[PDB]
Design brief:
The chain is of the alpha+beta class and about 650 residues long. The protein has eleven helices and 37 strands. The strands form nine sheets. Strands 16-15-14-12-20-21 form a six-stranded antiparallel sheet, sandwiched between helices. Strands 19, 23, 25, 26, 28 and 29 form a six-stranded mixed sheet that branches. The PDB classes it as structural protein.
């Protein structure tokens, strides 16, 4: 006399309570360690409540072979005596025909797809429905607990991210759609995680993060192709293409998207994560704190590059969890570091303090932001001369998106002590000691702007100081080369040879104009400018050298849009672009998109823009989703492609009326 009619999982209200409403309003997504409510409906009225309560039990199973030993299967009764810190169920409200049941899960529960089954005494198992269990940054007892609500909103609930690219002195923020709450992202992440057979460890955020980082790095190596090809629409299409093989592939000039894809997967599973960009990262050293750079007598580089290079930038995924298996004090931000393979979780503090030995990857991450650069001159005779070079600092302007804003947050102090400080000296000598136990008359100063306008003009200054008592015959070589983001040589653009005489004890300033029209070829897209100066005098056998990385600056895309907008009302955004180039802009396409504002994307064609003129396109659209939304605008033409800017708009609910 206890037959079940139906079970209402109340996906809308529970998903609102569990901060999973962006995932679905129909499927039940719950975070572990927090109660959720279901309604049980009976075919016939229940006469006596207490015996009926004694006659029912609930069962939760995950995976294909659930077992009590794996913690993948749990059986619990429905009573007020249940353990609220474990699997439990209590009837909170009841009618004659229905029970309102509050179900809890342990804060250390195995994540994934679950089935809820009801056991009536002397009857066969009845499936009540399906739900998906996630990590809970809102639960104090969870390993991924986050103290701040703002940090939870930024690192788990926000799908509108910013990946910082460019150079250290010219940081360009690219709008990124993480899209962790897209419909299939949770299913794709769990399917990828299912390639790991230690399902009992899926309760541990460290294990899940390591497994997913390794698998995603393997997929990135398998699917990213050697070199529109650079047009991006966030992490979700990349993840779909990596897992299914269908869609637009990613090419090696944008291999930095691995960090964003990992951030999306971790955020969708409930692990707080952020994308971190390190500028001037010394990659490929194996922990060695030295970088060898080789330049010819024209100040240019010949081959494709070395194995150990200083990248213009490198992206990485940081994730938030405790470290129970580590010595105390390493809870917080962890760096995902795949090793060609296996992935490692490195606390940021361990990198900062040089705690080489805590995890296997501490040495590589420490070398990435602490190596020194040694510059060699390759003479035409073949002999390799050492060079007196300016200091090339590594690990600059370590940046991530700020909390509760579109501003940029600098987090370099989490990774390094200030240069020349006592603490940095202590860390460096300790690391040197561990590794050792285990195993000129001329001064050049190069002044360059941080950016060069696209097809534009800039001025550079070389200051040469002669400290000899005699005048010097000095050959000054100036070179401009295009380099990819990962330090791979792209194209030789400009070379200039000067012959100067420096009076004794006299400083001389040489101003040189750096013009695009002087370049032997146009720099390839998404490349940076390596500017080098090389001063050689007589037969001193030593050359002064300085280098600077220059970003190519494109015209500013200005978006004008009201700060607030009413839901279900038309909203106009005007977009302007000034043609500051030396040619007309032809084949002009402008696209607008943004989740909660525009369904997918709309592409428009606008008229050709002559030099020194301005475009002014107005777009009208009606926002339909309440919240903090972002409009993303992309401009394509024959001079430049994938020029993206963004603007945030807060959409408010309509005023209440009758």
């Amino acid at each position: 006399a206890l037959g079940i009619k139906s079970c209402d999982f109340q996906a809308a209200r529970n998903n609102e309570e569990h901060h999973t409403k962006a995932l679905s309003s129909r499927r039940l997504f719950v975070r572990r360690g927090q109660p959720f409510t279901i309604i049980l409906y009976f075919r016939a009225p229940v006469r006596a409540f207490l015996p009926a309560l004694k006659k029912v039990a609930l069962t939760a199973q995950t995976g294909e072979q659930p077992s009590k030993i794996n913690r993948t299967q749990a059986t619990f009764p429905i009573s007020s005596l249940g353990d609220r810190k474990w699997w439990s169920a209590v009837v909170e409200e009841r009618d004659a025909q229905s029970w309102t049941i509050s179900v809890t899960t342990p804060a250390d529960a195995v994540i994934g797809h679950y089935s809820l089954l009801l056991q009536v005494s002397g009857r066969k198992q009845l499936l009540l429905g399906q739900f998906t269990l996630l990590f809970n940054p809102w639960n104090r007892e969870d390993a991924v607990f986050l103290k701040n609500e703002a940090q939870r909103m930024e690192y788990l609930l926000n799908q509108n991210g910013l990946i910082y690219l460019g150079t250290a002195d010219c940081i360009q923020a690219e709008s990124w759609d993480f899209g962790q709450f897209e419909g299939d992202v949770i299913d794709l992440s769990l399917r990828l995680l299912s390639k790991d057979k230690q399902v009992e460890k899926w309760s541990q955020p460290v294990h899940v993060a390591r497994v997913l980082g390794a698998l995603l790095h393997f997929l990135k190596e398998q699917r990213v192709l050697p070199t529109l090809l650079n047009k991006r629409r966030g992490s979700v299409p990349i993840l779909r293409q990596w897992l299914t093989g269908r869609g637009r592939p990613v090419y090696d000039g944008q291999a930095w998207v691995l960090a964003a894809v990992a951030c999306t997967v971790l955020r969708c599973l409930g692990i707080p994560a952020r994308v971190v960009t390190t500028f001037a990262s010394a990659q490929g050293t194996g922990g060695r704190l030295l970088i060898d750079e080789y330049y010819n007598e024209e100040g240019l580089q010949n081959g494709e590059g070395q194995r150990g290079r200083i990248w213009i930038f490198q992206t990485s995924t940081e994730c938030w969890m405790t470290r129970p298996a580590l010595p105390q004090g390493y809870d917080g931000w962890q760096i995902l570091h795949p090793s060609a393979g296996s992935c490692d979780l490195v606390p940021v503090r361990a990198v900062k303090e040089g705690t080489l030995g805590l995890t296997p990857a501490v040495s590589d991450l420490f070398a990435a932001i602490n190596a020194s650069c040694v510059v060699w001159k390759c003479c035409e005779d073949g002999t390799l001369e050492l060079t007196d070079s300016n200091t090339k600092y590594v690990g600059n302007n370590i940046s991530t998106k700020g909390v509760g804003s579109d501003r940029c947050e600098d987090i370099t102090q989490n990774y390094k002590y200030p240069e020349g400080s006592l603490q940095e000296k202590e860390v460096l000598e300790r690391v040197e000691k561990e590794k050792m136990e285990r195993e000129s008359p001329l001064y050049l100063l190069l002044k360059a702007p941080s950016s060069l306008p696209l097809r534009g003009d800039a001025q550079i200054s070389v200051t040469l100081v002669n400290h000899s008592e005699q005048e010097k015959a000095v050959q000054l070589a100036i070179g401009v080369q295009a380099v990819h983001y990962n330090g791979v040589l792209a194209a030789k653009l400009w070379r200039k040879k000067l012959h100067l005489t420096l009076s004794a004890n006299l400083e001389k300033i040489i101003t040189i104009g750096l013009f695009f029209s002087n370049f032997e070829r146009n720099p390839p897209e998404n490349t940076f400018l390596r500017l080098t100066a090389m001063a050689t005098h007589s037969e001193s056998n030593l050359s002064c050298f300085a280098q600077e990385d220059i970003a190519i600056c494109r015209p500013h895309l200005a978006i004008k849009m009201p700060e607030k907008a009413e839901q279900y009302q038309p909203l106009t955004a005007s977009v302007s672009l000034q043609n500051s180039l030396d040619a007309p802009m032809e084949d002009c396409v402008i696209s607008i998109l943004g989740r909660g504002l525009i369904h997918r994307e709309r592409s428009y064609r606008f008229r050709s823009v002559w030099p020194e003129n301005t475009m002014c396109a107005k777009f009208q659209f009606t926002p339909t989703h309440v919240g903090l939304q972002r409009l993303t605008v992309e401009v394509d033409c024959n001079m430049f492609q994938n020029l993206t800017n963004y603007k945030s708009v807060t959409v408010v609910a309509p005023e209440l009326s009758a």
